[PDB]
Symmetry: C2
Subunit: 285 residues, 2 copies
């Protein structure tokens, strides 16, 4: 029955389902943009970035199911920012939080493989439990990342439906079979996850503040990363009405609703516990 360092991580969908049951249904962004740093009374530089990130994981790493660092806010400081990102992700995972790397990568062939190498293989200094990816180059172009994710017990979140003003421009465009781009991505994901229990590893990004989700089949047997929690119409109590039966597969992501309470570690904890409990209760009802 031996241990070995090469043992595989259990599949992401299963690990995520367990984490949300155990710690509550919540993902907290790690979003050290200049606004939030100034709000925490920190400087807009690498030292500020680092203090913010460290405090978020110290306060919340043992308490939240999932974190979602946004790569751009680290990359703006170059390699030194990426070094803070490496440490942050390592510390978060060591505390038992899942990490969804929000980097929205998307490329072709060995270039796609190289992004997967960066984020989805265990030897990488940016190894994360899942990666957000953009499918502009087509679902099949993601194949190297899908395959490596399956091998590592990691997952993906493919951009599907976003709530920015322009998100419909591409997402609503219609293919020859009559499905739009978003519906096409959701169908690919449903096929990717077919038969995986209790939940597949290949999810979609679906904005919680959208009003037309009822026009999409969100039954993809994979997680739905839902940014915008706390915004008008996307309070915890609204989620069951927004997502229907699929709400059980939602990974609700809160950014400001938790982060604005830093740098006070008790205030951060209290806000995160409250969101997770309110979402748990809404979904249970």
């Amino acid at each position: 029955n031996l241990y070995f360092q090469g043992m595989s991580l259990e599949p992401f969908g299963a690990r995520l389902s367990r984490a949300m049951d155990d710690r509550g249904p919540l993902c907290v962004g790690i979003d050290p943009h200049a606004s939030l740093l100034a709000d925490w009374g920190l400087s807009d530089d690498v030292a500020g970035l680092e203090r913010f990130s460290r405090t978020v994981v110290e306060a919340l790493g043992e308490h939240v199911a999932v974190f979602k660092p946004q790569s751009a806010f680290f990359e703006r400081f170059g390699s030194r920012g990426v070094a803070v990102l490496e440490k942050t992700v390592a510390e978060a995972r060591a505390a038992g939080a899942l990490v969804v790397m929000d980097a929205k990568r998307g490329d072709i062939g060995s270039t796609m493989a190289a992004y997967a190498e960066a984020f989805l293989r265990k030897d990488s200094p940016l190894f994360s439990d899942a990666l957000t990816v953009s499918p502009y180059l087509g679902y099949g172009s993601l194949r190297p990342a899908v395959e490596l994710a399956r091998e590592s017990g990691a997952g993906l979140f493919v951009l599907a439906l976003t709530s920015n003003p322009e998100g419909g421009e591409v997402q609503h465009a219609v293919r020859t079979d009559g499905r739009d781009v978003a519906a096409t991505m959701l169908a690919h994901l449903a096929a990717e996850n077919a038969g995986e229990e209790p939940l597949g590893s290949f999810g979609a990004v679906v904005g919680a503040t959208l009003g037309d989700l009822s026009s999409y089949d969100l039954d993809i047997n994979g997680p739905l990363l839902a940014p915008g929690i706390g915004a008008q119409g996307a309070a915890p109590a609204d989620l069951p009405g927004v997502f229907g039966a699929a709400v059980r597969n939602v990974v609700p992501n809160v950014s400001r609703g938790v982060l604005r309470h830093g740098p006070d570690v008790r205030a951060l904890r209290t806000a995160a516990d409250r969101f997770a409990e309110e979402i748990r209760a809404a979904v249970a009802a």
Copy 2:
């Protein structure tokens, strides 16, 4: 008539047009993937990455109009890989080559602004003359990067038409006005560049090996970054037939056709000069 460190770079479209006239119409990829590193007899690690990148810029930095580092091949080594990327881009620009950062970024709002902060503002350790961006979230979502690029004298290349097997899945999907996604992006770019002389700063990625380019209006008054040069049907002599009148605005990107000749610096130079001359001659004819 004074110098000042704050002086603005001349607009990217104008600088690019001049660079291709002066040094020849060629962009050379900086693509340190494991295959090429092994081919150069280098190890698949940060030290190998660094030796490859240094040799490419030493051999070619004074001789080629444009370089295109592919971020993924650096990111796979984490922060230490990004640090090599920083130095490579700095050395390339110091040698007078333009640098197109191929990072295919795409996000929303202040997150998009943060990617622009990383790559398109002069104080950033990754400052590049242009950035490749993915428009899955809609052309308008790129606005923070467009605005910052204009301010810095930098440009963008928006993914439009790619030659991977799946590229049509999204790119050919049709909007309510009858234009497909690619055509919509090209039209946005034409509007972005309207009236800019001799060439606008906002370009498209358009694969040179595609067979249906005649169905698109590539007259966008901006540069067309064309990967695949050297591939079947995308030899230098084929480019005028592939791109029509718009061939004068093509930034032809060669990767293996030049890079396979390393680490020999005379062989790298000879290959780059030959591609640039053959393309110059084809376009002139």
